[PDB]
Amino acid sequence: LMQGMEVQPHIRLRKEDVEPVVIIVGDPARTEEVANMCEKKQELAYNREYRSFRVVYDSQPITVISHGIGCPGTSIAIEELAYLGAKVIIRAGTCGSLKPKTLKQGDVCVTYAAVNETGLISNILPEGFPCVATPHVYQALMDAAKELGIEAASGIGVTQDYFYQNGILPSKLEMYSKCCDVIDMEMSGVLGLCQARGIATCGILAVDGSPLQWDEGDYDATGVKATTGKENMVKITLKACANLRRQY
Amino acid sequence: LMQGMEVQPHIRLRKEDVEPVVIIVGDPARTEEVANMCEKKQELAYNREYRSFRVVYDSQPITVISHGIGCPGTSIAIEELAYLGAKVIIRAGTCGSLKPKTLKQGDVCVTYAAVNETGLISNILPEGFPCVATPHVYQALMDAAKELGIEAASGIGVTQDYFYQNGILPSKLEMYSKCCDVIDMEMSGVLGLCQARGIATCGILAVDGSPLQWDEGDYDATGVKATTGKENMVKITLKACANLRRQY
Amino acid sequence: LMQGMEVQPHIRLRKEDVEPVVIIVGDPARTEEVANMCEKKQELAYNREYRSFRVVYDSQPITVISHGIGCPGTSIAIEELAYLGAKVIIRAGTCGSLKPKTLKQGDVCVTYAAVNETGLISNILPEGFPCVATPHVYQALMDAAKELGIEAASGIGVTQDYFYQNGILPSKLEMYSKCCDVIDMEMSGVLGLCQARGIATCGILAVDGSPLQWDEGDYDATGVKATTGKENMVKITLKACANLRRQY
Amino acid sequence: LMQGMEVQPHIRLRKEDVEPVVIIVGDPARTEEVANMCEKKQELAYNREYRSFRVVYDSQPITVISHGIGCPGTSIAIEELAYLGAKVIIRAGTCGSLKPKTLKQGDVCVTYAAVNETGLISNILPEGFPCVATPHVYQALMDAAKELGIEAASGIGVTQDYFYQNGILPSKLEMYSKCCDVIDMEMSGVLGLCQARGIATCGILAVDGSPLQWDEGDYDATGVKATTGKENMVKITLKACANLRRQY
Amino acid sequence: LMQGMEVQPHIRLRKEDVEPVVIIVGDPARTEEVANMCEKKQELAYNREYRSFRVVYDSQPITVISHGIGCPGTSIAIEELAYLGAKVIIRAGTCGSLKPKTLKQGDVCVTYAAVNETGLISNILPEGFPCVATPHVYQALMDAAKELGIEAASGIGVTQDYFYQNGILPSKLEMYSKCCDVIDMEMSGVLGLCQARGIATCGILAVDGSPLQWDEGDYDATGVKATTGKENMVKITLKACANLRRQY
Amino acid sequence: LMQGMEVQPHIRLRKEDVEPVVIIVGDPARTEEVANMCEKKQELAYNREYRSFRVVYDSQPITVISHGIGCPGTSIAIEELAYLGAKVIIRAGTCGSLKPKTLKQGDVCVTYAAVNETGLISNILPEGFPCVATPHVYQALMDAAKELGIEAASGIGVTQDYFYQNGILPSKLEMYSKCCDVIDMEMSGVLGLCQARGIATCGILAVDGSPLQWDEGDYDATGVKATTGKENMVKITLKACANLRRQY
Ligand SMILES: O=c1[nH]cnc2c([C@@H]3N[C@H](CO)[C@@H](O)[C@H]3O)c[nH]c12
Ligand SMILES: O=c1[nH]cnc2c([C@@H]3N[C@H](CO)[C@@H](O)[C@H]3O)c[nH]c12
Ligand SMILES: O=c1[nH]cnc2c([C@@H]3N[C@H](CO)[C@@H](O)[C@H]3O)c[nH]c12
Ligand SMILES: O=c1[nH]cnc2c([C@@H]3N[C@H](CO)[C@@H](O)[C@H]3O)c[nH]c12
Ligand SMILES: O=c1[nH]cnc2c([C@@H]3N[C@H](CO)[C@@H](O)[C@H]3O)c[nH]c12
Ligand SMILES: O=c1[nH]cnc2c([C@@H]3N[C@H](CO)[C@@H](O)[C@H]3O)c[nH]c12
C-alpha cells in the first residue's frame, strides 16, 4: 500500500499551505515584492526556484509562489499546487512587446491566449489545443484594472522555450508580430496545463523591452518604466485575486 | 491598372450590403429562421451555399449569411465579408456533445476557444496559434443569455474536417472528450481566421447529439430538443449582436 | 437494437435515389445545368448545399449531386452516397491554372492525381497516401474526350483548404507550380476518400483563372471562356458516366 | 568555365549508352535475366550496384539497369539516367503482398501509385505529393498483359525505407493493409522522383511473400512461384517498353 | 552606436567572473555543495534561479552555477556563459532510471547523448540533430571515475519538458525504456545547445528513482542513496574539470 | 513449427561466416581493397550489392561486407549481420565536406554522430533519437589514427536519402554547414540502427569533394587525393578492428 508525500517534493508545501487562489511569478524575488503590498505575509518555503508565501489582501488569503524561467520548471509547480488543491492560477510575469509602436516598457497586457511554441504543450495536449484563459478570470483582471484606473491592454501572446534569438535557424519573431502582441517563455504552458488540469487561469504581463528592437537597445528590465509596470500589474492581480478568493 | 470587383464573387454582395456585425450559420435554411425573428428582413443574395439577409433587430441592422459545412467554404465567406467591411463575426451553429452526462440535445454552448484539427488553420497560421474568441464578444453572448434567463454553457470545442468517424485510422474523439466539451466542423477556422483578419469573434453552438453515442442513437438534428436549442441560441445571438452593432 | 435512417441526414436521399455512378459538382446550380443536357431529369432533394437529381443520358440513369466548396462538406456527401450504394464518383469542378502559358480560361484538365494540402486526408489516411484516380475511370473520361474531339489536358492538381492567398505565412503557389498543373479545393479529398472507401474515382476540371496572375486580373468564372470550358467538361463527363453506368 | 562529366559518376554511362526508355530493377542479377529474353544484348557497365545493358526487344533498343535496394541508391540512378536523356522509366521489381487472400507468391501487380513512407520523397517534394504512375505508361503495361494473356492485378503499393519489422515502435503493416495491396522499398521514390523530373513512369511488381505472414513462413524469393512471377512480369515489361520505345 | 552590458542580465556575471570550464547544476543548493568540496570558494552572484561560485579544485579555477529546472531557463544560463567566455560546460544533475534492474538510486551515469523531446532543441536546431557529448569531455569524466574507483555507467538519456506523467495523452516512458537508460529535463538541451555554440560538453547524472516504478514508491531524492550518488558524481566532475581547466 | 533460414536471404551468409567485428563499406569493390591490405582473405558471398569476405589482420578475423548506397539497403545488411552475431559494426565510407576550408579531398573524419534526415531512422526510432557512436569504438579509431600518425578529424556529419541537390524544394546544405562537418547517405542510419540493436558502432569517412562547391568542380572520387584518403581510412579501421576483435 502506498501513501502520499507529507510535503510535495519540489515546492515543499503541504495542503494547509496552499490557498484555492494562487499567484505565480517567474522570479523568486517578486514573491516578496507582492507580499510587501499586502496587509499580512508569511513565507512558507524556498526550495530550488520555488519560493512561496501566504499573503492576505483585502482580508483574503492568497498563495504566492515563484515558478522559475520556462514551462518545464513551471509544470512542476502547477502539478504540485494542483495536487494540493489550487483552483485558480494567475501568472503575473514580464514579457517583450511585439508591437513596439503601442506596447512599450512599463505597459501591462492581460493575455487571454498565447501561441504555443513549447515542448511541454506539444507533448501533453493534442495538436491544435488552444492555450487560452478562463473567461471569468480574464474578466476579474480587466475589472480590477478598470476600477483602479490602470490602463491594461488585452492581447494574445506567443511563448517560446528560449530567450535569445541566435541563429542556425531563422528567427520567427517577425512572423509572430503579425498575429500577436507580446512574447514570453511560460504563458502558453501555464494556460494550457491549467486548462488540462481544470484550473481556472489567466495571465498578465509587464513589458520590459521589444526583442524586435533589442539591437537598438530596447530592453530595460530593472529601469523605472519596467518597475512601475510590474507594480501596476501586481496591484491589478492582487485586487482580482481577493475577489476570486471570496468565491471559495 | 486594376480595380476591385463590384460584387464579391462567391457571396455576391457589395459593401452597402454588409453591416459591421455579421451572424454566420452553416445552413442556408437557418438564415431565414433568424430573419423571421426580426422586426424587418431583406434577402440580399443566394449563390452556391451563401444565402444572405439584412435583418433589423432591436432597431439595429445586422447581416446574416450561411457559410456551408466546413472551414474551406467558410474561409471564402469570411474573407469576402472582411473585404466588404465586417468588423464582428459570430458563428451560430450546431455541434455534437463530448460531455453526454452534462451537455445534451437542446443545450447551448458558447465556445470561447476550439481545438484545431483543420487544414485551413494549420496552413494559414503558425503552429500553436490559439483559435480563441474575442473576450468582449464572448461577454456579449453570455450577458445576453443571462438577461434572457437562458442557460448557456461556456466551453472549449474541437473542430474537425470531417463528420463521420469511419476508420482506417483510430478515432480521436475519446481523447478529445478529456479536454473538450463539444465538436463541430467550422469553429476553430472561424475563430482563428477572424483573429488573423482582426475581426472580433465568438461562437455559440446548439447540441444535436453526441458522437461518442451515435452507435446508441444519440442524434436528432430535426427533433424538438435540437429545434428549441437552436431557437434559444438565435435569441441570445440576436440580442448580443444588436448590442454590439450599436457601438459602430 | 438499432436501425438505419430512412433518408441520409445531410443529402436527404434513400438508397432507391442513388445510382452506382454519381457525378459530383461543387455548385448546386451546376446540378441543373448537367440535368438540362440529358434526355430525362428528376430533382430528388435539396438540403443545405446538397442538391440532387437523377438524370438519364444515353439511356443510362446517373446521379448528379452538389457537394459544396471544400473537402469537409464534400466528405459528408461522399460518405452518405457510399452508404447508399455509390460505386463510381467523378468530380466535375472548376479550378485555377498553375501553368498560365498552356492552361488558360476555358481549358479542361482531367486530374489523375492531386497533391494533398487538406486536413481531411491528413487525418483520415496515413501520411504519404496518394490521392489518385482509378485508372479505368480516368480512361473513360479521356476516351470520351477523344471521341468528342474535345481537347483535354491530363494533369496532377493541388488541393488546398482555402481560396484566397492572404499572408501571415508565405504562399506556396509558386512552389506548387513547379510540380503540378491546376489548383482547387476538393480534388485530393474526393480521390483520397473514394480510394479509402473502395469507390472508383477521377476528377475533371475547367479552368476559371490563374491565381499566380489574379493580381493582373486573370479570373473570370462567369465569362464565356469559363462557361464553354464547363460545358465541354460536362459533355465529356456525361459520355464517360453512361459508359461506366452500363457495367452495373 | 565548367564542363559536364564524360561518364556519369555512379552508373558510369555516357549519353550514347542510354535509350529514351529504361527498365530499372533492384538486383544486378536481374538485368542479365531480362537481357537473356531479348533478340540482342550488350553489357555496358557495372559499377557499385549499377549494372547496365542495352537490349533489343521486338527490334526496339531499351536500356536495362539495376538500382539497388532502397530509394537513395535508386535516386542516383534516376538522376544520372535523366541527365543522360531517359524519358520513360519503369521499375520491374519484387514486393510483399498485403492482401494474402488474393495476391500470393508468383502473382504480378501493376502499381499505379504508392503510399510514401520514404525520406527521399518527404524531403524533395512538398508534403502530400502523390507518388503516381503516368497513365499512358500504366496503360501500356496493362495492355501488354492483356495481349499476353497474363493476369496482372492493378493496385496501390506502400514503400518503406526498411525491410524487417523488428520493433521499438509498432509495425504499421496492419494499417497499410487496409488501404494498400503490396509493399516494397523503392516504388514511391521511383514514381515520385520521375514525376518531379518529368519522366513518364510506372511500376510492376512480382510477389515473393506476405510480411503479415512471415511468422508462418510466407516468403520464398527463390522458389518456383516467385521465379515464374518475375518471368511473367519481365514479359509484360519488355512488350510494353518496345511499344513505348517506338514513339521516340 | 550600441555597447554590451556590463553584467549579463540573468546570471549577473561579468567576463572576469567566468572561467573557461563551467559546471552547471539544476539546484542553487548544489552549487554550495560543490564549492564545499574545493580548496577555495567565492560566491559571485545569485539572481533568480542562477547562483554562481568560483571554486578552486586541484589548483584549478572553475565556475559553478545553477541553471534551474528545464531547458528554457538553462538556455539563458548557457547563452550568457558563452558570451562571457565559457569553453567547456558539464551538467552534473539528477535523473530517473529507465533501467530499474541495473541502474538504481545512488548510481551514476555519464550520458554521452540524449533523446530530445524538448521544444528548445526542436526549434533552434534542424530536425534530427544529435544531442551528443564532446568525446574528449566524456573521456575526462570516465577517466576521472576510473581513477577514483567509482563505478559510472555510460549511457543515452532522454530529456522531456515535464516531470509528472499525468495523462490526457499516453506516457512514452515504456517506449523510451527500450532505447534509453535514464530520464531528465535538461540534458538534450545542454548537449545540443553547447554543440551549436561550439562549447565542449558532456553530462553526468545521479539516479534518484525510477519513474516506471514511481507507483511503487521508487523515488527518494533526499535519501542516503541519492545523496551519496550525487557526492560521487561531484567527485568525478571536479576531478575531470580540473584536468580540462589546465588546457586553457 | 518454424525454423531459421540456413543462409540469411540478402547477404547470403550463415553464422559461421560472420565475426563479432564487422567493417561495412558502401561499394562492393572496396571489400576487396580492404581484403588486399590483410594477411589472409576469403571471399564468402556476393549477392545483390552485398559482397562479403573474412579477413585476417594482426592475427584477428574480421568480417568485411558492402551495404550499397543508402540507409534502406544498409538496414538489411545490418539486421542480417546482427541476427548472425555481429557485435561491432564500423562504417568506413566516403563523404562530402561541409567545411571546405579545413576538410578537403583526401582528408579523413571520424564521425561520432550524425544529423538524421533519413526515413529509416525517422520511422524506426522515436523523434529526437541521437544517431551517435559508441564511445569506446570512437576511441579505438582515434587511438589507431594517433598510433599510425595519420591525421583524423573528429566531427558530426549529416545523412540524407539523396545525393543530387535538384530543387522543387530549397537545398538545406547551407544550413547544415553551420552545425556539422561532413555529409553522406548512410551514417545516421548505421549509428542509429546499431544503437537500437545493441551493436557497438562508429563511422569513419574519407572526403571526395564538397557539395557546397560542386558548381566549381570540387569533386574527384577517383583521384589520387580521394584514393589516398580511403587508403588511410582503411589503415585506421583495420588497426582499430583487430584491437576490438581481441576482446571477443
Ligand atoms: O523579451 C522577452 N522575450 C522572452 N521572454 C521574456 C520575459 C520573461 N521574463 C523571463 C526572461 O527574462 C522569462 O520568464 C520570460 O517569460 C521578459 N521579457 C521577455
Ligand atoms: O456531432 C457533430 N460532429 C461534427 N459536426 C457537427 C455539427 C455541425 N453541423 C454540420 C454537420 O451537421 C457541420 O457544420 C458541423 O459543424 C453538428 N453536429 C456535429
Ligand atoms: O483558382 C482557384 N483556386 C482554388 N480553387 C478554385 C476553384 C474551385 N471552385 C470553387 C471556388 O470558386 C472551389 O470549389 C474550388 O475547388 C476554381 N478556381 C479556383
Ligand atoms: O515483403 C517485402 N517487403 C518489402 N520489400 C520487399 C521486396 C523488394 N525487394 C528488395 C528486398 O528483397 C527491395 O528492393 C524491396 O523493394 C520484395 N519483397 C518485399
Ligand atoms: O525521474 C525523473 N524524471 C525527470 N527528471 C528528473 C530529475 C531532474 N531533476 C529535476 C527534477 O527533480 C530536473 O532538473 C530533472 O532534470 C531527477 N529525476 C528525474
Ligand atoms: O558529397 C556527398 N554527398 C552525399 N553522399 C556522399 C558520399 C557517399 N558515397 C556514396 C555516394 O557516392 C554514398 O554512399 C554516400 O554515402 C560521398 N560523397 C558524398
Side-chain angles (χ1 to χ4, degrees), chain B residues 1-165 167-248:
Chain B
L1 292 182
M2 294 287 103
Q3 74 200 353
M5 289 173 75
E6 204 159 330
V7 325
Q8 287 304 107
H10 297 93
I11 68 176
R12 295 295 178 79
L13 299 185
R14 299 166 159 93
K15 63 181 168 166
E16 30 283 310
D17 299 326
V18 172
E19 297 295 334
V21 179
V22 183
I23 295 165
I24 65 174
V25 291
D27 184 357
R30 193 172 316 129
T31 62
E32 198 168 352
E33 291 175 351
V34 176
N36 288 336
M37 289 191 173
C38 299
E39 330 173 320
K40 282 166 242 287
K41 71 180 186 183
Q42 178 58 58
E43 194 167 343
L44 303 155
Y46 192 177
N47 183 55
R48 291 169 167 279
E49 57 261 74
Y50 308 106
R51 188 182 181 196
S52 53
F53 283 79
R54 171 180 283 107
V55 308
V56 178
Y57 191 88
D58 195 11
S59 301
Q60 297 302 316
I62 299 150
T63 301
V64 187
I65 184 173
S66 58
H67 58 70
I69 292 170
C71 291
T74 301
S75 77
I76 288 177
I78 295 173
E79 295 277 17
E80 296 186 3
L81 289 164
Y83 177 84
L84 293 181
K87 300 297 196 277
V88 176
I89 292 179
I90 297 175
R91 167 169 152 71
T94 55
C95 70
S97 166
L98 298 184
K99 253 60 178 203
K101 291 260 190 154
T102 47
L103 278 172
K104 297 192 163 62
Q105 291 171 28
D107 291 330
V108 168
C109 181
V110 178
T111 62
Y112 63 92
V115 176
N116 181 65
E117 203 195 282
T118 75
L120 170 68
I121 300 297
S122 289
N123 288 280
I124 66 163
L125 289 159
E127 187 174 350
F129 191 90
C131 298
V132 60
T134 309
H136 79 267
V137 184
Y138 168 89
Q139 288 305 136
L141 289 163
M142 291 298 296
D143 287 345
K146 183 161 185 171
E147 183 162 283
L148 291 167
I150 299 173
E151 44 183 70
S154 168
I156 297 174
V158 54
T159 302
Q160 294 188 315
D161 274 346
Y162 42 98
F163 180 82
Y164 295 101
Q165 302 285 318
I168 282 177
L169 296 179
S171 177
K172 280 172 266 190
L173 301 189
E174 292 281 332
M175 179 273 292
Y176 285 138
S177 75
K178 303 306 186 269
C179 63
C180 292
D181 298 319
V182 295
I183 179 149
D184 87 324
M185 293 173 69
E186 306 83 21
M187 195 63 68
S188 71
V190 175
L191 300 176
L193 179 63
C194 284
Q195 290 292 357
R197 295 293 170 278
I199 292 177
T201 189
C202 195
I204 182 164
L205 296 168
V207 175
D208 68 9
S210 170
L212 303 169
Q213 294 172 348
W214 276 350
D215 66 329
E216 313 182 302
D218 189 358
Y219 180 86
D220 195 358
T222 51
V224 72
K225 278 152 129 57
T227 305
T228 306
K230 291 187 282 176
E231 289 168 359
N232 289 340
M233 169 181 71
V234 177
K235 292 182 178 158
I236 293 156
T237 308
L238 283 168
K239 178 172 282 288
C241 282
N243 288 328
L244 293 162
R245 179 59 182 88
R246 245 188 236 102
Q247 321 206 259
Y248 293 93

Side-chain angles (χ1 to χ4, degrees), chain A residues 174-239:
Chain A
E174 274 263 12
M175 179 266 294
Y176 284 137
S177 75
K178 302 288 199 260
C179 61
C180 39
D181 301 303
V182 295
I183 177 152
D184 85 325
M185 292 172 72
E186 307 84 18
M187 195 63 67
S188 67
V190 174
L191 299 178
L193 176 64
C194 285
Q195 290 291 357
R197 297 289 168 274
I199 296 178
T201 187
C202 194
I204 183 172
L205 298 166
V207 176
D208 65 9
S210 175
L212 304 168
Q213 294 174 350
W214 279 350
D215 61 332
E216 296 182 276
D218 190 2
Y219 180 86
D220 195 354
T222 50
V224 296
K225 279 164 158 68
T227 302
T228 299
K230 290 187 292 176
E231 287 167 347
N232 289 340
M233 168 179 76
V234 173
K235 290 176 177 167
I236 291 158
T237 306
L238 281 172
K239 183 169 279 300

Side-chain angles (χ1 to χ4, degrees), chain D residues 115-136:
Chain D
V115 176
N116 181 65
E117 203 195 282
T118 75
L120 170 68
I121 300 297
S122 289
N123 288 280
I124 66 163
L125 289 159
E127 187 174 350
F129 191 90
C131 298
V132 60
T134 309
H136 79 267

Side-chain angles (χ1 to χ4, degrees), chain F residues 148-168:
Chain F
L148 285 159
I150 298 169
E151 60 198 306
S154 170
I156 297 172
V158 56
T159 302
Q160 294 191 309
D161 277 340
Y162 46 95
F163 182 82
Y164 294 102
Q165 303 288 316
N166 293 136
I168 309 265

